[PDB]
Design a protein around this ligand. Structure first.
Ligand code: CLA
Ligand code: CLA
Ligand SMILES: CCCCCCCCCCCCCCCC(=O)O[C@H](COC(=O)CCCCCCCCCCCC)CO[C@@H]1O[C@@H](CO)[C@H](O)[C@H](O)[C@@H]1O
Ligand code: HEM
Ligand SMILES: CC1=C(/C=C/C(C)=C/C=C\C(C)=C\C=C/C=C(C)/C=C/C=C(C)/C=C/C2=C(C)CCCC2(C)C)C(C)(C)CCC1
Ligand SMILES: CC1=C(/C=C/C(C)=C/C=C\C(C)=C\C=C/C=C(C)/C=C/C=C(C)/C=C/C2=C(C)CCCC2(C)C)C(C)(C)CCC1
Ligand SMILES: CC1=C(/C=C/C(C)=C/C=C\C(C)=C\C=C/C=C(C)/C=C/C=C(C)/C=C/C2=C(C)CCCC2(C)C)C(C)(C)CCC1
Lengths: 137, 36, 242, 98, 30, 37, 49, 36
């Protein structure tokens, strides 16, 4: 009714294709996002390094584009700075590096796609409350 | 310290005026026996 | 040979390295060798505040002051290439290191005068025709002294420089001007000028120690008061390597 | 004889409109395709530039990096280094977090 | 000035403690 | 805690008080001026 | 053998001061309520003879 | 009118302090009969 189909529909590829979505996947998104750890990352900011946020625009300006339901996947699989210059894999949860961050082991392409869709979706509803912290709270 | 001017006559008189009342009423009574 | 768990508590880490009396043996400088300094340390002891002389014009004074903040004073871990320019004199250009310890000494009266003991952006040089560092050698050069406080900083009542309430605030229809001193917070930048004479040198180690005297300014306090002059004394160690 | 706030004034130069190579916080560097991460560490490090272009002639810049800068050159500007803005290594961490 | 006013009160009160404890009207068991 | 004999009462009659007051109220009236400088 | 200038610039602060009627105890007033300072003010320095 | 500052606490207390004394001593005596 409010969490509508297309409002739950988001960009897939840097090429335009949209994957829409389900109430099921979205949920795993929430369950995940938090379990995958919001511990630094809670709400829509980034406690280890507050300079970078998860707001839609920020992910677009990233390199490579990281607003794609795809993008975030590469990342979670293998991480890269906002340079896309050096792999940040050792300091960031990543399937490339499971042996460091356990929570990242039980993760799957199914589980990923979800935690992903969660990121591109949350802004659509929460508005700015997504990027900002304290201030907007 | 830039403070109010009546600080003294205010605070002070506030003490000595009512106080003096009680003072009076006591020694006025403790003198019933002519003692005091 | 001493561990942190062995030296912590002594209030020793604030006093830095000595050189035993096997010194006076000059260090063999090349002119064919690059040379750099390893942890140049300035441990101090004597803080003198030039007394804001009264209106009368007869020799302004340099009173002695009492230290307040216990041991948070000394500075070291300073490093920088030690240049060997023409006429065989050495110039040491500091690149970085812990060198801005903020201290607050208590003046003759009750004054609390705070300065930022520092030897930053330091460029010290010595006498010419020197192929060896010894009790003879000495170092003189300039500084760079910002201000006690950074750019941000809110004085009680909210005012500030690169932030902060911006005005009289608490007083709304108050008389704007004359508070300029307080509101607009200017930020100082001034020269220091130390002087380093060696007293104990080891020929092989590259180690060398001695007394130093820095003459700098105090706390600008954004605009508050005109700073007070300060002279600083104490011994200093400073190991040299190639 | 009229003292005045420095940051407030320099906010009146081109510093307030674009990104100041010599002063501006390193944080305003993310707002453009692939600049933040490294290029910035070099942009910010590396002496203060008298000309907006001397950026392009920075020791060791990469054949690609070189490009980027060129590309983004649009948004960079300069003004005297501001003692109050650069001291305290604030440029690396201005005290401004989300 | 005003800080003496503070200290004067503060004090004459400590002495209202004197009298009220030591020259206080005693409890008569009758 | 034995009573001291010398406990004579004190005296200031309906009149003496009028004078005592007339005495002060006056100087007060006189010096006031000089107390203002 | 000194400039009339070196001469007086020779005389010591405190001493000139003593030669200032403003310290001569008599000059006061029975009701002149306070410390010599809210009088001529706070002596900051000697101007010169 | 630029006048002394203690004018009030001076002149005033000068009145009320001694006066209060006499006041006390009177009603302390006029109360021998318990009257007053
Ligand atoms: C201003 C309005 C007002 C009016 C019309 C009255 C009228 C009265 N008061 Mg009274 N009174 C007042 C204000 C007033 N009072 C205030 C502000 C106080 C604070 C102390 C008192 C305290 C007081 C006491 C303790 C007693 C009365 C008594 C009385 C009655 C007897 C007449 C008298 O002499 O009073 C007495 C007081 C005054 C006339 C003036 C008091 C002004 C204060 C107390 C100055 C400092 C104390 C001083 C008066 C000493 C009073 C002790 C005692 C004799 C009252 C009379 C009905 C009774 C009486 O007079 O006979 C037993 C009585 O016992 N009053
Ligand atoms: C500061 C030095 C000083 C000392 C060592 C004494 C010592 C004494 N006074 Mg005393 N007195 C003083 C100052 C002093 N007085 C001043 C400045 C006054 C002006 C009023 C008085 C007025 C006074 C009276 C009327 C009487 C004494 C009495 C006495 C003797 C009994 C103890 C007593 O309670 O006094 C009484 C007074 C005080 C202890 C404090 C008085 C301070 C003034 C009066 C405040 C305003 C009035 C208040 C005290 C009411 C007092 C009424 C009366 C009970 C005294 C004792 C030897 C006699 C006594 O106490 O027993 C009969 C006595 O009758 N005094
Ligand atoms: C010229 C115009 C100017 C206008 C005003 C002029 C009026 C002057 C009148 C004065 C007459 C001469 C001397 C009067 C003396 C007198 O009066 O003496 C006693 C009065 O009490 C008194 O007043 C006793 C004085 C107590 C004053 C209390 C305030 C001073 C100390 C407060 C300290 C607080 C920290 C009364 O008499 C005394 O007491 C009598 C008993 O009632 C005895 O019989 C004796 O006569 C004994 O001498
Ligand atoms: C588990 C779910 C997480 C997801 C989906 C996620 C996602 C991301 C993304 C997309 C970025 C880059 C943002 C951009 O440049 O646009 C990033 C950066 C970063 N993340 Fe996470 N993150 C997660 C968990 C964590 C955790 C648990 C930490 C704690 C160490 C962390 C620390 C960081 C840091 C420090 C950066 C900045 C990288 C740098 O520039 O050095 N992240 N994250
Ligand atoms: C000072 C001050 C002030 C105020 C004031 C006042 C106001 C005071 C007072 C007070 C007063 C002014 C009070 C009053 C009153 C009163 C009275 C005093 C009363 C009464 C009465 C009596 C006492 C008596 C009476 C009678 C008799 C005698 C008997 C019977 C009959 C008849 C009733 C008539 C100010 C603000 C500036 C601030 C500072 C301080
Ligand atoms: C400025 C001035 C002044 C002033 C003064 C005054 C204001 C005063 C006072 C006064 C006072 C200040 C007072 C007081 C007091 C008293 C006291 C202080 C007492 C006491 C008490 C006690 C000590 C007690 C004890 C006890 C008790 C009671 C019980 C419990 C506890 C005990 C046991 C401990 C002078 C003169 C200095 C100088 C000139 C001017
Ligand atoms: C304020 C004023 C002033 C001055 C002041 C004064 C100084 C005051 C006061 C006063 C006083 C400060 C007085 C005093 C005193 C006192 C007394 C108060 C006394 C005593 C005592 C008593 C009361 C008691 C005692 C006792 C008893 C209790 C019993 C027996 C034992 C004996 C002896 C211990 C001036 C200049 C600023 C000016 C303005 C005003």
């Amino acid at each position: 009714a409010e969490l509508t189909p297309e409002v739950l529909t988001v960009p897939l590829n840097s090429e335009g294709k949209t994957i829409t979505l389900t109430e099921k996947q979205y949920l795993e998104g929430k369950r995940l996002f938090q379990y995958a750890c919001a511990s630094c990352h809670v709400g829509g900011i980034t406690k280890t390094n507050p300079s970078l946020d998860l707001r839609t625009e920020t992910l677009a300006l990233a390199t490579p584009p990281r607003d794609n339901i795809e993008g975030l996947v590469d990342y979670m699989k293998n991480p890269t700075t906002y340079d896309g210059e050096q792999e940040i894999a050792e300091v960031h949860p990543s399937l490339r590096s499971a042996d460091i961050f356990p929570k990242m082991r039980n993760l799957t392409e199914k589980d990923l796609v979800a935690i992903a869709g969660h990121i591109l979706v949350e802004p659509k509803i929460l508005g700015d409350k997504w990027g900002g912290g304290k201030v907007y709270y | 310290m830039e403070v109010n001017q009546l600080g003294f006559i205010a605070t002070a008189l506030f003490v000595l005026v009512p106080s003096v009342f009680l003072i009076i009423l006591y020694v006025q009574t403790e003198s019933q026996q002519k003692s005091s | 040979t001493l561990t942190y768990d062995d030296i912590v508590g002594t209030g020793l880490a604030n006093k830095c390295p000595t050189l035993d009396d096997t010194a006076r043996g000059a260090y063999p400088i090349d002119s064919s060798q690059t040379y750099r300094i390893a942890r140049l340390c300035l441990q101090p002891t004597t803080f003198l505040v030039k007394e804001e002389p009264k209106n009368k014009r007869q020799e302004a004074e340099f009173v002695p002051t009492k230290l307040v903040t216990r041991e948070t004073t000394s500075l070291d871990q300073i490093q920088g290439e030690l240049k060997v320019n023409s006429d065989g004199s050495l110039t040491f250009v500091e690149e970085d290191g812990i060198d801005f310890q903020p201290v607050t000494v208590q003046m003759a009266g009750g004054e609390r005068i705070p300065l930022l003991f520092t030897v930053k952006n330091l460029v010290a040089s010595t006498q010419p025709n020197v192929t060896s560092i010894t009790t003879s050698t000495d170092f003189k050069g300039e500084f760079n002294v910002p201000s006690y406080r950074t750019a941000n900083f809110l004085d009680p009542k909210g005012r500030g420089l690169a932030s902060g309430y911006d005005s009289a605030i608490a007083l709304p229809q108050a008389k704007e001007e004359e508070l300029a001193r307080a509101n607009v917070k200017r930020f100082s930048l001034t020269k220091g000028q130390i002087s380093l004479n060696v007293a104990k040198v080891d020929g092989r180690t590259g180690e060398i120690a001695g007394t130093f005297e820095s003459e700098q300014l105090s706390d600008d306090d954004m605009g508050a008061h005109e700073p007070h002059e300060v002279k600083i004394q104490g011994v200093f160690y400073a190991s040299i390597e190639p | 004889e009229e003292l005045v706030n420095v940051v407030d004034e320099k906010l009146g130069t081109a510093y307030g409109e674009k990104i100041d190579l010599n002063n501006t916080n390193i944080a305003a560097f993310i707002q453009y395709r692939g600049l933040y991460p490294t290029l910035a560490k070099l942009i910010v490090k590396n002496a203060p530039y008298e000309s907006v272009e001397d950026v392009l002639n920075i020791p060791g810049l990469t054949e690609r990096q070189k490009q980027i800068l060129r590309e983004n050159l649009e948004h960079f500007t300069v003004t005297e280094v501001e003692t109050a803005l650069v001291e305290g290594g604030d440029r690396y961490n201005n005290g401004l977090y989300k | 000035m005003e800080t003496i006013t503070y200290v004067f009160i503060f004090a004459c009160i400590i002495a209202l403690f004197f009298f009220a404890i030591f020259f206080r009207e005693p409890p008569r068991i009758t | 805690m034995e009573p001291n004999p010398n406990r004579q009462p004190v005296e200031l009659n309906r009149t003496s008080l009028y004078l005592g007051l007339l005495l002060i109220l006056v100087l007060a009236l006189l010096f006031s001026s000089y107390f203002f400088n | 053998g000194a400039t009339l200038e070196e001469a007086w610039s020779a005389i010591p602060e405190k001493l000139a001061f003593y030669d200032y009627i403003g310290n001569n105890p008599a000059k006061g007033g029975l009701f002149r309520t306070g410390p010599m300072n809210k009088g001529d003010g706070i002596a900051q320095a000697w101007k010169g003879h």
